Nucleic acid binder design. Sequence first.
DNA 1: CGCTACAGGTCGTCC
DNA 2: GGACGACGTGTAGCG
Lengths: 239, 239
Amino acid sequence: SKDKVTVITSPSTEELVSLVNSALLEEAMLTIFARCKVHYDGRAKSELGSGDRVIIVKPDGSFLIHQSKKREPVNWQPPGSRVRLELRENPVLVSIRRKPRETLEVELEEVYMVSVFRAEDYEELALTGSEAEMAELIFENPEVIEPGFKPLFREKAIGTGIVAVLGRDSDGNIVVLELKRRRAELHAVRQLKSYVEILREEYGDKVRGILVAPSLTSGAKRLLEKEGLEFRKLEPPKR
Amino acid sequence: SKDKVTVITSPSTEELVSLVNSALLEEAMLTIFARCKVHYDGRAKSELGSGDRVIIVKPDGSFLIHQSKKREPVNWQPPGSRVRLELRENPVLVSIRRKPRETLEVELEEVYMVSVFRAEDYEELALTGSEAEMAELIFENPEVIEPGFKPLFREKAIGTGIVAVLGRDSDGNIVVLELKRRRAELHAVRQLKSYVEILREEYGDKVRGILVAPSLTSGAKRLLEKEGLEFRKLEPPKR
DNA sequence: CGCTACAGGTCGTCC
DNA sequence: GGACGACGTGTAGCG
Ligand SMILES: [Mg+2]
Ligand SMILES: [Mg+2]
Protein backbone atom coordinates (compact mmCIF):
# COMPACT_ATOMS: atom_id res chain seq x y z
CA SER A 1 0.00 0.00 0.00
CA LYS A 2 3.07 2.30 0.05
CA ASP A 3 4.08 1.79 -3.64
CA LYS A 4 2.72 4.54 -5.92
CA VAL A 5 1.94 2.00 -8.57
CA THR A 6 0.88 -1.58 -8.59
CA VAL A 7 0.65 -3.13 -12.06
CA ILE A 8 -0.29 -6.50 -13.34
CA THR A 9 -0.39 -7.50 -16.98
CA SER A 10 -2.58 -10.41 -17.98
CA PRO A 11 -3.95 -10.66 -14.41
CA SER A 12 -5.87 -13.68 -13.20
CA THR A 13 -9.39 -13.07 -11.98
CA GLU A 14 -8.04 -13.38 -8.45
CA GLU A 15 -5.45 -10.71 -9.29
CA LEU A 16 -8.06 -8.48 -10.90
CA VAL A 17 -10.30 -8.66 -7.85
CA SER A 18 -7.46 -8.02 -5.49
CA LEU A 19 -6.26 -4.89 -7.30
CA VAL A 20 -9.70 -3.56 -8.16
CA ASN A 21 -10.91 -3.84 -4.58
CA SER A 22 -7.73 -2.40 -3.12
CA ALA A 23 -7.97 0.57 -5.47
CA LEU A 24 -11.43 1.31 -4.05
CA LEU A 25 -10.57 0.83 -0.37
CA GLU A 26 -7.34 2.75 -0.78
CA GLU A 27 -9.13 5.46 -2.76
CA ALA A 28 -6.51 5.29 -5.46
CA MET A 29 -6.92 5.75 -9.21
CA LEU A 30 -7.71 2.48 -10.96
CA THR A 31 -6.58 2.04 -14.59
CA ILE A 32 -7.32 -0.97 -16.79
CA PHE A 33 -6.56 -1.85 -20.44
CA ALA A 34 -9.16 -4.31 -21.61
CA ARG A 35 -11.24 -5.79 -24.34
CA CYS A 36 -14.80 -5.01 -23.22
CA LYS A 37 -18.41 -4.37 -24.05
CA VAL A 38 -20.22 -1.37 -22.59
CA HIS A 39 -23.86 -0.96 -21.66
CA TYR A 40 -25.25 2.38 -20.50
CA ASP A 41 -28.81 3.24 -19.43
CA GLY A 42 -29.60 6.52 -17.80
CA ARG A 43 -30.54 9.86 -19.27
CA ALA A 44 -30.11 8.02 -22.53
CA LYS A 45 -29.18 4.49 -23.53
CA SER A 46 -26.19 3.06 -25.40
CA GLU A 47 -24.39 -0.10 -26.51
CA LEU A 48 -20.74 -0.39 -27.35
CA GLY A 49 -19.59 -3.66 -28.85
CA SER A 50 -16.45 -5.64 -28.07
CA GLY A 51 -13.19 -3.69 -28.39
CA ASP A 52 -10.05 -2.51 -26.61
CA ARG A 53 -10.28 0.57 -24.36
CA VAL A 54 -8.64 2.35 -21.46
CA ILE A 55 -10.75 2.36 -18.30
CA ILE A 56 -10.22 4.79 -15.39
CA VAL A 57 -12.05 4.89 -12.03
CA LYS A 58 -11.13 7.89 -9.92
CA PRO A 59 -11.34 7.74 -6.08
CA ASP A 60 -14.23 10.28 -6.25
CA GLY A 61 -16.30 7.89 -8.36
CA SER A 62 -15.64 9.45 -11.76
CA PHE A 63 -15.61 6.68 -14.31
CA LEU A 64 -14.01 7.01 -17.81
CA ILE A 65 -13.96 4.76 -20.86
CA HIS A 66 -11.66 5.87 -23.70
CA GLN A 67 -11.29 4.67 -27.26
CA SER A 68 -8.08 5.22 -29.21
CA LYS A 69 -9.58 8.33 -30.80
CA LYS A 70 -11.09 11.67 -29.74
CA ARG A 71 -11.04 13.72 -26.50
CA GLU A 72 -14.35 12.66 -25.01
CA PRO A 73 -14.79 9.34 -23.25
CA VAL A 74 -17.11 7.03 -25.22
CA ASN A 75 -18.85 6.37 -21.89
CA TRP A 76 -18.51 7.65 -18.40
CA GLN A 77 -20.01 8.19 -14.99
CA PRO A 78 -19.84 11.46 -12.99
CA PRO A 79 -18.23 12.09 -9.60
CA GLY A 80 -20.07 10.42 -6.75
CA SER A 81 -21.00 7.32 -8.64
CA ARG A 82 -20.43 3.95 -6.99
CA VAL A 83 -18.74 0.99 -8.67
CA ARG A 84 -18.79 -2.69 -7.69
CA LEU A 85 -16.86 -5.43 -9.53
CA GLU A 86 -19.07 -8.33 -10.44
CA LEU A 87 -18.12 -11.88 -11.26
CA ARG A 88 -20.36 -13.39 -13.93
CA GLU A 89 -19.56 -15.15 -17.18
CA ASN A 90 -16.96 -12.37 -17.20
CA PRO A 91 -15.92 -9.85 -14.58
CA VAL A 92 -18.17 -6.80 -14.91
CA LEU A 93 -17.53 -3.29 -13.76
CA VAL A 94 -20.85 -1.80 -12.66
CA SER A 95 -21.16 1.93 -11.85
CA ILE A 96 -24.36 3.50 -10.56
CA ARG A 97 -25.31 7.09 -9.97
CA ARG A 98 -28.38 7.89 -7.88
CA LYS A 99 -30.06 11.07 -9.06
CA PRO A 100 -30.77 10.74 -11.90
CA ARG A 101 -30.43 6.98 -11.96
CA GLU A 102 -27.75 5.91 -14.43
CA THR A 103 -26.12 2.54 -14.87
CA LEU A 104 -22.84 1.85 -16.58
CA GLU A 105 -21.83 -1.79 -17.15
CA VAL A 106 -18.35 -2.69 -18.40
CA GLU A 107 -18.02 -6.37 -19.25
CA LEU A 108 -14.34 -7.24 -19.11
CA GLU A 109 -13.70 -9.95 -21.70
CA GLU A 110 -9.94 -9.74 -21.51
CA VAL A 111 -7.94 -7.63 -19.07
CA TYR A 112 -4.54 -6.81 -20.54
CA MET A 113 -3.57 -4.69 -17.57
CA VAL A 114 -4.86 -3.58 -14.19
CA SER A 115 -3.19 -0.96 -12.06
CA VAL A 116 -3.52 1.00 -8.87
CA PHE A 117 -2.01 4.48 -8.88
CA ARG A 118 -1.89 6.07 -5.46
CA ALA A 119 -1.67 9.59 -6.63
CA GLU A 120 -0.81 12.50 -4.42
CA ASP A 121 -1.90 15.92 -5.69
CA TYR A 122 -2.38 19.00 -3.51
CA GLU A 123 -2.23 21.41 -6.39
CA GLU A 124 -5.07 23.00 -8.34
CA LEU A 125 -5.38 24.67 -11.69
CA ALA A 126 -4.85 28.39 -12.07
CA LEU A 127 -6.49 29.59 -15.30
CA THR A 128 -6.57 33.06 -16.78
CA GLY A 129 -8.34 34.64 -19.78
CA SER A 130 -11.89 33.81 -18.63
CA GLU A 131 -15.15 35.78 -18.99
CA ALA A 132 -15.05 36.54 -15.25
CA GLU A 133 -11.74 38.32 -15.84
CA MET A 134 -13.31 40.38 -18.62
CA ALA A 135 -15.88 41.51 -16.08
CA GLU A 136 -13.07 42.54 -13.72
CA LEU A 137 -11.14 44.45 -16.36
CA ILE A 138 -14.35 46.30 -17.25
CA PHE A 139 -15.08 47.32 -13.65
CA GLU A 140 -11.44 48.30 -13.20
CA ASN A 141 -11.25 50.25 -16.42
CA PRO A 142 -14.77 50.99 -17.75
CA GLU A 143 -13.31 52.94 -20.61
CA VAL A 144 -12.46 49.75 -22.54
CA ILE A 145 -16.18 49.83 -23.24
CA GLU A 146 -16.43 53.61 -23.81
CA PRO A 147 -15.87 56.96 -22.04
CA GLY A 148 -18.30 57.61 -19.22
CA PHE A 149 -19.52 54.05 -19.00
CA LYS A 150 -20.28 53.26 -15.37
CA PRO A 151 -20.49 49.56 -14.42
CA LEU A 152 -22.90 48.88 -11.54
CA PHE A 153 -23.91 45.20 -11.31
CA ARG A 154 -22.29 41.88 -12.15
CA GLU A 155 -24.55 38.83 -12.73
CA LYS A 156 -27.63 40.84 -11.94
CA ALA A 157 -30.81 38.86 -11.97
CA ILE A 158 -33.38 40.74 -13.96
CA GLY A 159 -36.84 39.27 -14.21
CA THR A 160 -36.07 36.35 -16.44
CA GLY A 161 -32.36 35.64 -16.85
CA ILE A 162 -29.10 36.89 -15.33
CA VAL A 163 -27.22 39.65 -17.12
CA ALA A 164 -23.45 39.71 -17.03
CA VAL A 165 -22.98 43.43 -16.50
CA LEU A 166 -25.58 46.07 -15.91
CA GLY A 167 -24.56 49.73 -16.01
CA ARG A 168 -25.08 53.31 -17.12
CA ASP A 169 -23.66 55.54 -19.84
CA SER A 170 -22.79 59.23 -19.97
CA ASP A 171 -26.40 59.95 -21.09
CA GLY A 172 -27.70 58.14 -18.04
CA ASN A 173 -29.12 55.18 -19.94
CA ILE A 174 -29.16 51.68 -18.52
CA VAL A 175 -26.58 49.52 -20.31
CA VAL A 176 -26.62 45.71 -20.61
CA LEU A 177 -23.33 44.04 -21.55
CA GLU A 178 -23.12 40.43 -22.72
CA LEU A 179 -19.52 39.21 -22.60
CA LYS A 180 -17.96 36.33 -24.51
CA ARG A 181 -14.30 35.31 -24.00
CA ARG A 182 -14.35 34.10 -27.61
CA ARG A 183 -15.97 34.85 -30.97
CA ALA A 184 -19.59 35.60 -30.20
CA GLU A 185 -22.32 33.59 -31.85
CA LEU A 186 -26.04 33.83 -32.53
CA HIS A 187 -26.82 32.50 -29.01
CA ALA A 188 -24.80 35.34 -27.42
CA VAL A 189 -26.92 37.91 -29.28
CA ARG A 190 -30.08 36.09 -28.30
CA GLN A 191 -29.08 36.33 -24.63
CA LEU A 192 -28.49 40.10 -24.96
CA LYS A 193 -31.61 40.74 -27.00
CA SER A 194 -33.63 38.82 -24.43
CA TYR A 195 -32.22 40.87 -21.54
CA VAL A 196 -32.59 44.24 -23.29
CA GLU A 197 -36.22 43.54 -24.19
CA ILE A 198 -37.00 42.68 -20.57
CA LEU A 199 -35.31 45.89 -19.38
CA ARG A 200 -36.84 47.99 -22.19
CA GLU A 201 -40.29 47.09 -20.91
CA GLU A 202 -39.34 48.61 -17.54
CA TYR A 203 -36.97 51.47 -18.53
CA GLY A 204 -38.01 52.48 -22.07
CA ASP A 205 -36.45 52.24 -25.52
CA LYS A 206 -33.28 54.09 -24.57
CA VAL A 207 -31.83 50.91 -23.01
CA ARG A 208 -28.62 49.95 -24.79
CA GLY A 209 -27.33 46.42 -25.36
CA ILE A 210 -23.65 45.87 -26.03
CA LEU A 211 -22.12 42.57 -27.05
CA VAL A 212 -18.52 42.53 -25.75
CA ALA A 213 -16.32 39.90 -27.45
CA PRO A 214 -12.99 39.54 -29.31
CA SER A 215 -14.98 39.18 -32.59
CA LEU A 216 -18.34 37.93 -33.87
CA THR A 217 -19.79 35.63 -36.53
CA SER A 218 -21.56 36.72 -39.71
CA GLY A 219 -24.85 35.67 -38.12
CA ALA A 220 -24.29 37.53 -34.86
CA LYS A 221 -23.50 40.77 -36.70
CA ARG A 222 -26.67 40.53 -38.76
CA LEU A 223 -28.96 39.97 -35.83
CA LEU A 224 -27.18 42.51 -33.65
CA GLU A 225 -27.61 45.13 -36.37
CA LYS A 226 -31.21 44.18 -37.09
CA GLU A 227 -32.00 44.54 -33.39
CA GLY A 228 -30.17 47.84 -32.92
CA LEU A 229 -27.65 46.37 -30.56
CA GLU A 230 -24.02 47.29 -30.34
CA PHE A 231 -20.64 45.59 -30.39
CA ARG A 232 -17.43 46.42 -28.54
CA LYS A 233 -14.25 44.52 -29.37
CA LEU A 234 -12.53 43.24 -26.21
CA GLU A 235 -9.97 40.39 -25.80
CA PRO A 236 -10.06 38.31 -22.64
CA PRO A 237 -7.13 39.38 -20.45
CA LYS A 238 -4.41 36.93 -19.36
CA ARG A 239 -2.63 37.50 -16.00
CA SER B 1 6.74 -4.98 -28.51
CA LYS B 2 4.59 -7.55 -30.35
CA ASP B 3 2.51 -7.66 -27.16
CA LYS B 4 -0.69 -5.65 -26.88
CA VAL B 5 0.69 -4.02 -23.72
CA THR B 6 4.12 -2.91 -22.64
CA VAL B 7 4.62 -1.54 -19.08
CA ILE B 8 7.70 -0.08 -17.42
CA THR B 9 7.59 1.18 -13.82
CA SER B 10 10.18 3.75 -12.80
CA PRO B 11 11.60 4.01 -16.35
CA SER B 12 15.02 5.44 -17.15
CA THR B 13 15.08 8.36 -19.56
CA GLU B 14 16.12 5.97 -22.25
CA GLU B 15 13.30 3.63 -21.20
CA LEU B 16 10.92 6.60 -21.20
CA VAL B 17 11.98 7.88 -24.60
CA SER B 18 11.80 4.43 -26.09
CA LEU B 19 8.15 3.72 -25.11
CA VAL B 20 6.96 7.17 -26.04
CA ASN B 21 8.63 6.75 -29.45
CA SER B 22 7.00 3.38 -30.05
CA ALA B 23 3.55 4.53 -29.00
CA LEU B 24 3.63 7.29 -31.63
CA LEU B 25 5.11 5.07 -34.37
CA GLU B 26 2.88 2.14 -33.63
CA GLU B 27 -0.23 4.30 -33.39
CA ALA B 28 -0.76 2.94 -29.88
CA MET B 29 -2.15 4.52 -26.70
CA LEU B 30 0.42 6.04 -24.44
CA THR B 31 -0.34 6.14 -20.72
CA ILE B 32 1.94 7.71 -18.12
CA PHE B 33 1.66 7.91 -14.33
CA ALA B 34 3.72 10.85 -13.19
CA ARG B 35 4.49 13.69 -10.89
CA CYS B 36 4.42 16.70 -13.16
CA LYS B 37 3.86 20.35 -13.92
CA VAL B 38 1.55 21.55 -16.66
CA HIS B 39 1.81 24.79 -18.56
CA TYR B 40 -0.85 25.67 -21.15
CA ASP B 41 -1.10 28.60 -23.48
CA GLY B 42 -3.64 29.01 -26.25
CA ARG B 43 -7.24 30.21 -26.27
CA ALA B 44 -6.53 30.87 -22.57
CA LYS B 45 -3.55 30.39 -20.21
CA SER B 46 -3.11 28.07 -17.25
CA GLU B 47 -0.62 26.64 -14.78
CA LEU B 48 -0.77 23.46 -12.71
CA GLY B 49 1.92 22.91 -10.06
CA SER B 50 3.69 19.68 -9.17
CA GLY B 51 1.38 16.78 -8.38
CA ASP B 52 0.54 13.27 -9.53
CA ARG B 53 -1.66 12.75 -12.56
CA VAL B 54 -2.55 10.23 -15.21
CA ILE B 55 -1.50 11.23 -18.75
CA ILE B 56 -2.97 9.78 -21.91
CA VAL B 57 -1.85 10.40 -25.47
CA LYS B 58 -4.08 8.92 -28.12
CA PRO B 59 -2.88 7.91 -31.57
CA ASP B 60 -5.17 10.56 -33.15
CA GLY B 61 -3.38 13.27 -31.17
CA SER B 62 -5.82 13.66 -28.29
CA PHE B 63 -3.91 14.45 -25.12
CA LEU B 64 -5.44 14.02 -21.64
CA ILE B 65 -4.30 14.94 -18.18
CA HIS B 66 -6.34 13.65 -15.24
CA GLN B 67 -6.22 14.56 -11.59
CA SER B 68 -7.78 12.14 -9.11
CA LYS B 69 -11.00 14.14 -9.19
CA LYS B 70 -13.85 15.00 -11.57
CA ARG B 71 -14.79 13.78 -15.05
CA GLU B 72 -12.88 16.42 -16.95
CA PRO B 73 -9.17 16.41 -17.65
CA VAL B 74 -7.42 19.31 -15.89
CA ASN B 75 -5.61 20.01 -19.23
CA TRP B 76 -5.71 18.53 -22.67
CA GLN B 77 -5.14 18.82 -26.35
CA PRO B 78 -7.73 17.93 -29.10
CA PRO B 79 -7.45 15.35 -31.95
CA GLY B 80 -4.84 16.44 -34.49
CA SER B 81 -2.29 17.83 -32.08
CA ARG B 82 1.33 16.89 -32.55
CA VAL B 83 3.33 15.74 -29.55
CA ARG B 84 7.07 15.40 -29.04
CA LEU B 85 9.28 14.65 -26.04
CA GLU B 86 12.05 17.11 -25.24
CA LEU B 87 14.85 16.34 -22.86
CA ARG B 88 15.47 19.39 -20.79
CA GLU B 89 16.48 19.05 -17.09
CA ASN B 90 13.38 16.81 -16.96
CA PRO B 91 11.65 15.26 -19.94
CA VAL B 92 8.90 17.49 -21.22
CA LEU B 93 5.95 16.33 -23.24
CA VAL B 94 5.07 19.07 -25.68
CA SER B 95 1.88 18.91 -27.63
CA ILE B 96 0.89 21.70 -29.96
CA ARG B 97 -2.30 22.41 -31.75
CA ARG B 98 -2.15 24.41 -34.92
CA LYS B 99 -5.27 26.57 -35.58
CA PRO B 100 -5.82 28.09 -33.14
CA ARG B 101 -2.25 27.85 -31.94
CA GLU B 102 -2.19 26.14 -28.59
CA THR B 103 0.72 24.59 -26.74
CA LEU B 104 0.62 22.13 -23.81
CA GLU B 105 3.79 21.42 -21.82
CA VAL B 106 4.07 18.63 -19.30
CA GLU B 107 7.25 18.57 -17.29
CA LEU B 108 7.76 15.00 -16.06
CA GLU B 109 9.49 15.37 -12.69
CA GLU B 110 9.04 11.71 -11.87
CA VAL B 111 7.62 9.01 -14.10
CA TYR B 112 6.09 6.28 -11.95
CA MET B 113 4.90 4.30 -14.94
CA VAL B 114 4.88 4.48 -18.72
CA SER B 115 2.93 2.09 -20.91
CA VAL B 116 2.09 1.38 -24.52
CA PHE B 117 -1.29 -0.17 -25.30
CA ARG B 118 -1.83 -1.25 -28.89
CA ALA B 119 -5.53 -1.15 -28.78
CA GLU B 120 -7.73 -2.74 -31.38
CA ASP B 121 -11.20 -1.32 -31.66
CA TYR B 122 -13.44 -1.60 -34.73
CA GLU B 123 -16.63 -0.78 -32.84
CA GLU B 124 -18.67 2.45 -32.83
CA LEU B 125 -20.93 3.61 -29.96
CA ALA B 126 -24.64 3.19 -30.57
CA LEU B 127 -26.74 5.61 -28.56
CA THR B 128 -30.50 6.05 -28.33
CA GLY B 129 -32.69 8.72 -26.72
CA SER B 130 -31.29 11.68 -28.66
CA GLU B 131 -33.01 14.84 -29.98
CA ALA B 132 -32.71 13.51 -33.53
CA GLU B 133 -34.83 10.54 -32.48
CA MET B 134 -37.47 12.92 -31.19
CA ALA B 135 -37.54 14.51 -34.65
CA GLU B 136 -37.87 11.12 -36.41
CA LEU B 137 -40.73 10.22 -34.13
CA ILE B 138 -42.43 13.48 -35.07
CA PHE B 139 -42.05 12.89 -38.78
CA GLU B 140 -43.14 9.24 -38.40
CA ASN B 141 -45.97 10.30 -36.09
CA PRO B 142 -46.97 14.01 -36.22
CA GLU B 143 -50.01 13.58 -33.99
CA VAL B 144 -47.57 13.32 -31.05
CA ILE B 145 -47.56 17.09 -31.62
CA GLU B 146 -51.24 17.62 -32.46
CA PRO B 147 -53.81 16.26 -34.92
CA GLY B 148 -53.31 17.41 -38.52
CA PHE B 149 -49.85 18.74 -37.85
CA LYS B 150 -47.78 18.57 -41.04
CA PRO B 151 -44.01 18.38 -40.55
CA LEU B 152 -42.22 19.89 -43.57
CA PHE B 153 -38.55 20.51 -42.74
CA ARG B 154 -35.96 19.29 -40.29
CA GLU B 155 -32.86 21.34 -39.29
CA LYS B 156 -33.90 24.15 -41.61
CA ALA B 157 -31.80 27.20 -42.14
CA ILE B 158 -34.11 30.13 -41.93
CA GLY B 159 -32.39 33.45 -42.43
CA THR B 160 -30.74 33.78 -39.04
CA GLY B 161 -30.47 30.46 -37.23
CA ILE B 162 -31.61 26.88 -37.77
CA VAL B 163 -34.99 25.48 -36.83
CA ALA B 164 -35.39 21.94 -35.49
CA VAL B 165 -38.70 21.21 -37.21
CA LEU B 166 -40.70 23.49 -39.50
CA GLY B 167 -44.29 22.70 -40.42
CA ARG B 168 -47.96 23.66 -40.74
CA ASP B 169 -51.04 23.07 -38.66
CA SER B 170 -54.55 22.24 -39.82
CA ASP B 171 -55.63 25.92 -39.69
CA GLY B 172 -52.93 26.94 -42.17
CA ASN B 173 -50.50 28.50 -39.69
CA ILE B 174 -46.77 27.90 -39.90
CA VAL B 175 -45.37 25.90 -36.96
CA VAL B 176 -41.85 26.12 -35.46
CA LEU B 177 -40.87 23.27 -33.14
CA GLU B 178 -37.99 23.70 -30.71
CA LEU B 179 -37.07 20.21 -29.36
CA LYS B 180 -35.15 19.33 -26.21
CA ARG B 181 -34.21 15.81 -25.12
CA ARG B 182 -34.25 17.00 -21.53
CA ARG B 183 -35.94 19.60 -19.37
CA ALA B 184 -36.06 22.83 -21.34
CA GLU B 185 -34.39 25.94 -19.99
CA LEU B 186 -34.43 29.65 -20.83
CA HIS B 187 -31.89 29.00 -23.60
CA ALA B 188 -34.47 26.85 -25.51
CA VAL B 189 -37.29 29.38 -25.26
CA ARG B 190 -34.91 32.09 -26.49
CA GLN B 191 -34.14 29.88 -29.52
CA LEU B 192 -37.89 29.33 -30.12
CA LYS B 193 -38.86 33.02 -29.69
CA SER B 194 -36.03 34.03 -31.99
CA TYR B 195 -37.14 31.74 -34.85
CA VAL B 196 -40.82 32.55 -34.50
CA GLU B 197 -40.11 36.27 -34.72
CA ILE B 198 -37.95 35.76 -37.82
CA LEU B 199 -40.73 33.70 -39.41
CA ARG B 200 -43.35 36.33 -38.47
CA GLU B 201 -41.30 38.83 -40.50
CA GLU B 202 -42.12 36.90 -43.70
CA TYR B 203 -45.48 35.25 -42.95
CA GLY B 204 -46.95 37.65 -40.42
CA ASP B 205 -49.09 36.78 -37.43
CA LYS B 206 -49.87 33.27 -38.68
CA VAL B 207 -46.82 31.64 -37.02
CA ARG B 208 -46.96 29.37 -33.92
CA GLY B 209 -44.02 28.32 -31.76
CA ILE B 210 -44.04 25.06 -29.89
CA LEU B 211 -41.46 23.90 -27.38
CA VAL B 212 -41.33 20.13 -27.33
CA ALA B 213 -39.61 18.54 -24.34
CA PRO B 214 -40.09 16.18 -21.38
CA SER B 215 -40.49 19.29 -19.15
CA LEU B 216 -39.65 22.98 -18.49
CA THR B 217 -37.68 24.96 -15.90
CA SER B 218 -39.56 27.69 -14.02
CA GLY B 219 -37.90 30.40 -16.12
CA ALA B 220 -38.67 28.62 -19.37
CA LYS B 221 -42.36 28.23 -18.51
CA ARG B 222 -42.52 31.80 -17.28
CA LEU B 223 -40.96 33.21 -20.45
CA LEU B 224 -42.84 30.79 -22.69
CA GLU B 225 -46.18 31.92 -21.28
CA LYS B 226 -45.18 35.58 -21.44
CA GLU B 227 -44.56 35.41 -25.19
CA GLY B 228 -47.59 33.17 -25.72
CA LEU B 229 -45.58 30.26 -27.07
CA GLU B 230 -46.68 26.66 -26.54
CA PHE B 231 -45.40 23.50 -24.86
CA ARG B 232 -45.91 19.83 -25.76
CA LYS B 233 -44.51 17.21 -23.42
CA LEU B 234 -42.47 14.59 -25.21
CA GLU B 235 -39.83 12.17 -23.98
CA PRO B 236 -36.99 11.21 -26.31
CA PRO B 237 -37.72 7.65 -27.48
CA LYS B 238 -35.27 4.92 -26.39
CA ARG B 239 -35.32 2.55 -29.36
C1' DC C 1 -31.81 20.17 -4.81
C1' DG C 2 -33.36 23.47 -9.13
C1' DC C 3 -32.24 27.43 -12.04
C1' DT C 4 -28.97 29.75 -14.81
C1' DA C 5 -25.07 30.41 -17.74
C1' DC C 6 -19.78 29.52 -18.84
C1' DA C 7 -16.25 26.37 -20.88
C1' DG C 8 -9.39 26.39 -23.44
C1' DG C 9 -16.02 23.40 -23.86
C1' DT C 10 -15.94 18.99 -27.76
C1' DC C 11 -18.26 17.37 -31.74
C1' DG C 12 -20.88 16.82 -36.20
C1' DT C 13 -23.29 18.73 -40.01
C1' DC C 14 -23.91 21.60 -43.67
C1' DC C 15 -23.78 26.20 -46.09
C1' DG D 1 -13.33 26.05 -43.26
C1' DG D 2 -17.00 29.17 -40.80
C1' DA D 3 -21.50 28.92 -38.60
C1' DC D 4 -24.66 26.86 -35.88
C1' DG D 5 -26.55 23.99 -32.32
C1' DA D 6 -26.83 19.37 -29.57
C1' DC D 7 -24.55 17.01 -25.85
C1' DG D 8 -25.95 11.13 -21.24
C1' DT D 9 -22.74 17.79 -22.11
C1' DG D 10 -19.70 18.92 -17.10
C1' DT D 11 -18.93 22.45 -13.69
C1' DA D 12 -19.68 26.54 -10.71
C1' DG D 13 -22.44 30.15 -8.47
C1' DC D 14 -26.49 31.24 -6.21
C1' DG D 15 -31.07 30.73 -3.61
MG1 LIG E 1 -23.78 36.07 -19.92
MG1 LIG F 1 -32.94 23.69 -31.59
